[PDB]
């Protein structure tokens with residue numbers, strides 16, 4: 519099989535349905551920030567592979583994945599049990615549309631996500647190129663429960679202290695977690711908050727316009743479609759195809775199987 523077999527380095531469970539893990543990374547595995555790759559486990563004679571956004575920075579020699587834990591999900595029912603040292607199959611060629619090159623120059627980069635959709639954005643917010651290209655980077659992470667706001671500490675406390683671009687992070691990264699079913703400082707769906715302009719008021723930024731604002735949307739199919747429409751409502755135009763820069767990019771965080 520032409521798959522990499524990486525080794526789990528660490529695992530961290532965020533809550534009952536979310537966990538992340540880091541694995542070794544084959545030097546041959548190159549990827550652009552935002553991309554996903556197939557990862558999985560050998561099950562009953564065949565790799566059980568699923569598309570996974572690489573949540574780690576593309577210049578670090580390890581991979582990190584932010585994962586859902588579906589009770590009876592073929593892969594995650596097993597993946598949730600990953601432990602240090604475990605093998606993880608990883609495909610050789612990443613892919614995906616959430617890449618910097620396909621966003622026209624702009625001033626603000628909105629990373630609109632829900633659930634595990636924040637995964638590729640974890641890579642984005644750790645990518646120096648993100649800060650080279652934007653004045654502001656807004657990571658919106660919409661979840662149902664506060665416990666699902668995975669990486670909170672990393673985003674708000676660790677990343678800003680990053681030895682090399684923590685200053686860029688402090689100056690440019692706005693983290694806007696959103697919770698919809700539990701008391702939280704920022705309540706609601708980002709679609710609604712953007713339509714009302716509340717999201718931008720909350721983060722101290724002007725409403726979006728096609729000239730200044732770019733976005734990457736990664737979330738549930740439903741959110742993806744509606745958020746895309748919201749951005750369209752502001753006059754932004756999605757990149758029509760890879761290699762063809764646009765105002766925003768989208769990728770489903772998952773698909774209903």
Ligand SMILES: Cc1cc2nc3c(=O)[nH]c(=O)nc-3n(C[C@H](O)[C@H](O)[C@H](O)COP(=O)(O)OP(=O)(O)OC[C@H]3O[C@@H](n4cnc5c(N)ncnc54)[C@H](O)[C@@H]3O)c2cc1C
Pocket residue numbers: 554568569570571572583584585586587588590591592593594595614633634635637638769770771772773774775
């Ligand atoms: C481009 C792309 C990138 C992806 N990146 C990630 C990632 O970084 N992390 C991750 O956990 N998953 C990601 N997914 C989903 C992932 O590929 C699998 O669906 C996941 O790993 C669950 O596999 P499964 O075999 O356990 O359950 P599956 O049979 O895949 O899915 C079972 C059911 O789980 C729900 N489901 C699956 N994945 C999710 C999810 N992430 N969040 C909420 N509900 C979900 C749906 O209701 C689905 O029908 C991605 C999917 C695509 C298409």
Ligand SMILES: NC(=O)c1ccc[n+]([C@@H]2O[C@H](COP(=O)([O-])OP(=O)(O)OC[C@H]3O[C@@H](n4cnc5c(N)ncnc54)[C@H](OP(=O)(O)O)[C@@H]3O)[C@@H](O)[C@H]2O)c1
Pocket residue numbers: 632633634660661662663696697698699706707708709710737738739740741742744745774
């Ligand atoms: N197929 C879909 O499009 C879809 C979408 C959402 C959930 N689900 C189901 O519920 C499970 C958990 O899905 P999830 O991972 O994304 O967790 P989720 O909790 O269901 O969604 C996380 C966040 O996304 C928000 N959201 C949902 N729909 C939205 C929309 N159209 N626009 C903007 N924000 C939206 C939710 O608000 P609310 O609390 O108001 O829902 C919540 O804050 C999935 O495994 C799936 O079975 C499916």
